[PDB]
Design an enzyme around this catalytic site. Structure first.
Site, PDB file in Angstrom:
ATOM      1  N   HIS B  69      26.286 -13.043 -30.054  1.00 57.91           N
ATOM      2  CA  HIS B  69      25.483 -12.356 -29.060  1.00 57.91           C
ATOM      3  C   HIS B  69      25.690 -12.789 -27.593  1.00 57.91           C
ATOM      4  O   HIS B  69      25.148 -13.815 -27.223  1.00 57.91           O
ATOM      5  CB  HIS B  69      23.956 -12.398 -29.182  1.00 57.91           C
ATOM      6  CG  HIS B  69      23.449 -11.829 -30.480  1.00 57.91           C
ATOM      7  ND1 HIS B  69      22.522 -12.486 -31.258  1.00 57.91           N
ATOM      8  CD2 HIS B  69      23.831 -10.766 -31.192  1.00 57.91           C
ATOM      9  CE1 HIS B  69      22.312 -11.853 -32.345  1.00 57.91           C
ATOM     10  NE2 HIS B  69      23.056 -10.765 -32.331  1.00 57.91           N
ATOM     11  N   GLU B  72      23.345 -14.456 -24.676  1.00 53.97           N
ATOM     12  CA  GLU B  72      22.845 -15.771 -25.063  1.00 53.97           C
ATOM     13  C   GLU B  72      23.776 -16.846 -24.536  1.00 53.97           C
ATOM     14  O   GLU B  72      24.242 -17.673 -25.330  1.00 53.97           O
ATOM     15  CB  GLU B  72      22.722 -15.889 -26.607  1.00 53.97           C
ATOM     16  CG  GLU B  72      21.819 -14.813 -27.198  1.00 53.97           C
ATOM     17  CD  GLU B  72      21.771 -14.836 -28.711  1.00 53.97           C
ATOM     18  OE1 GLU B  72      22.381 -15.669 -29.320  1.00 53.97           O
ATOM     19  OE2 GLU B  72      21.159 -13.866 -29.145  1.00 53.97           O
ATOM     20  N   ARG B 127      23.566  -7.609 -25.788  1.00 55.43           N
ATOM     21  CA  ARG B 127      23.625  -8.413 -26.987  1.00 55.43           C
ATOM     22  C   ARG B 127      24.644  -7.930 -28.026  1.00 55.43           C
ATOM     23  O   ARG B 127      24.900  -8.638 -29.031  1.00 55.43           O
ATOM     24  CB  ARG B 127      22.243  -8.507 -27.695  1.00 55.43           C
ATOM     25  CG  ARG B 127      21.961  -7.617 -28.838  1.00 55.43           C
ATOM     26  CD  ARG B 127      20.897  -7.589 -29.863  1.00 55.43           C
ATOM     27  NE  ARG B 127      20.365  -8.883 -30.214  1.00 55.43           N
ATOM     28  CZ  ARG B 127      20.147  -9.170 -31.470  1.00 55.43           C
ATOM     29  NH1 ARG B 127      20.911  -9.564 -32.417  1.00 55.43           N
ATOM     30  NH2 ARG B 127      18.989  -8.937 -32.103  1.00 55.43           N
ATOM     31  N   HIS B 196      22.626 -19.802 -31.472  1.00 49.96           N
ATOM     32  CA  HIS B 196      21.948 -18.678 -30.843  1.00 49.96           C
ATOM     33  C   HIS B 196      21.072 -19.253 -29.759  1.00 49.96           C
ATOM     34  O   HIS B 196      21.007 -20.471 -29.704  1.00 49.96           O
ATOM     35  CB  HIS B 196      21.212 -17.883 -31.908  1.00 49.96           C
ATOM     36  CG  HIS B 196      22.043 -17.009 -32.785  1.00 49.96           C
ATOM     37  ND1 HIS B 196      22.157 -15.663 -32.533  1.00 49.96           N
ATOM     38  CD2 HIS B 196      22.769 -17.168 -33.875  1.00 49.96           C
ATOM     39  CE1 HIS B 196      22.841 -15.069 -33.456  1.00 49.96           C
ATOM     40  NE2 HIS B 196      23.270 -15.958 -34.253  1.00 49.96           N
ATOM     41  N   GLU B 270      18.562 -22.056 -32.703  1.00 52.70           N
ATOM     42  CA  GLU B 270      18.146 -21.221 -31.569  1.00 52.70           C
ATOM     43  C   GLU B 270      18.038 -22.147 -30.380  1.00 52.70           C
ATOM     44  O   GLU B 270      17.106 -22.960 -30.575  1.00 52.70           O
ATOM     45  CB  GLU B 270      16.696 -20.862 -31.834  1.00 52.70           C
ATOM     46  CG  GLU B 270      16.358 -19.424 -31.880  1.00 52.70           C
ATOM     47  CD  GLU B 270      17.524 -18.484 -32.080  1.00 52.70           C
ATOM     48  OE1 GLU B 270      17.768 -18.063 -33.201  1.00 52.70           O
ATOM     49  OE2 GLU B 270      18.108 -18.381 -30.975  1.00 52.70           O
TER      50      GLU B 270
HETATM   51 ZN    ZN Z   1      21.147 -14.236 -31.110  1.00 53.46          ZN
END
Ligand code: ZN
Lengths: 37, 307
Positions: B69, B72, B127, B196, B270
């Site tokens: 993505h 990010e 994204r 992420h 994350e």
């Molecule tokens: Zn992501």
């Protein structure tokens, strides 16, 4: 008007997040509209 | 720039600045690093994987991916710091050297190269990849909704203009097929981590279902352990658990798939923020994030070698 009115709105479905262009995922751990990460 | 000692790790760079660093690194350490092209993107850019090895057979490898993505940004940039840091800790840190002395590491910094360059010249908040095709007017697939793990079930959207749009079939996306074929050929992946942004969470399967992984216990504790260690440096506090449990049901995610393949230590990270900054994490926050988030990937590895 200035970005995402819905962001940080109390959620319970992804649906309860009317439609922010940004914050459109419910976070099942801060039951708040946030964006998909 | 002309040297990895002089390449600025505490700035946001471009595709070209990074395809380039990858070239400095190897030239600097051809005996430790190799640069592998596992594919060519949607819109023709080479997809590069960087393999870190001290030699041997088809040693059990660790897989780490960044940027599935594009928006990010801190993951590509954490990505660059890991490559740099592998190369320096080897033979320095016994722990880190132990692991390279037994396992190969596979590092992929810009998994979604198309979408990343898109974030630079057009829209910073892109994204998805940049695939055209569809009854569409609407381009791109959520590549973390494309893998063959509960594919196309709830947690992935069927319309193409969607952010969570899943593609017409699993692996339809070449950025996604590369890894898969690749992971699947090697057959000696005992770890799979996907980075992420943002929110400070360490996640394990599953995303598309409620049923709980057999190795639920194990992963919880390593998760437990690994969130502990990241917090040691700057005190950043994370949360950990299954995806379905701690963010949202997400069918077809990366970890889901690898897990069912038998890649036991499959985790999704994350990174920072929690939202003040979210996708626009200021640059002053990269070294920190990278250093903590390494203490955590490191944990998962010792664990991977230990068992
Ligand atoms: Zn992501």
């Amino acid at each position: 008007x200035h970005a995402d009115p819905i962001c940080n709105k109390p959620c319970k479905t992804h649906d309860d997040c009317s439609g922010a262009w940004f914050c459109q995922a419910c976070w099942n751990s801060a039951r708040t509209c946030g964006p998909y990460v | 720039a002309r040297s990895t000692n002089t390449f600025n790790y505490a700035t946001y760079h471009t595709l070209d600045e990074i395809y380039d660093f990858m070239d400095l690194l190897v030239a600097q350490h051809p005996e430790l690093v190799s640069k592998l092209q596992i594919g060519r993107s949607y819109e023709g850019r080479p997809i590069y994987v960087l393999k870190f090895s001290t030699g041997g057979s088809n040693r059990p490898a660790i897989w780490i991916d960044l940027g599935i993505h594009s928006r990010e940004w801190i993951t590509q940039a954490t990505g660059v710091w890991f490559a740099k840091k592998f190369t320096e800790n080897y033979g320095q840190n016994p722990s880190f050297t132990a692991i390279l002395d037994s396992m190969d590491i596979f590092l992929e910094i810009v998994t979604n190269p198309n979408g990343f360059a898109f974030t630079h010249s057009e829209n910073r908040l892109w994204r998805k990849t940049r695939s055209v095709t569809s009854s569409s007017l609407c381009v791109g697939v959520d590549a973390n909704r494309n893998w063959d793990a509960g594919f196309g079930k709830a947690g992935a959207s069927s319309s193409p203009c969607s952010e969570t749009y899943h593609g017409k079939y699993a692996n339809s996306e070449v950025e996604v097929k590369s890894i898969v074929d690749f992971v699947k050929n090697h057959g000696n992946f005992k770890a799979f981590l996907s980075i992420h942004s943002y929110s400070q969470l360490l996640l394990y399967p599953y995303g598309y279902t409620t049923q709980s992984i057999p190795d639920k216990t194990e992963l919880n504790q390593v998760a437990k352990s690994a969130v502990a260690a990241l917090k040691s440096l700057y005190g950043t506090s994370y949360k950990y658990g299954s995806i379905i449990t701690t963010i949202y049901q997400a069918s077809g995610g990366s970890i889901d798939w690898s897990y069912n393949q038998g890649i036991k230590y499959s985790f999704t990270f994350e990174l920072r923020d929690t939202g003040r900054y979210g996708f626009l994490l200021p640059a002053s926050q990269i070294i920190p994030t990278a250093q903590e988030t390494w203490l955590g990937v490191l944990t998962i590895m010792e664990h991977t070698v230990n068992n």
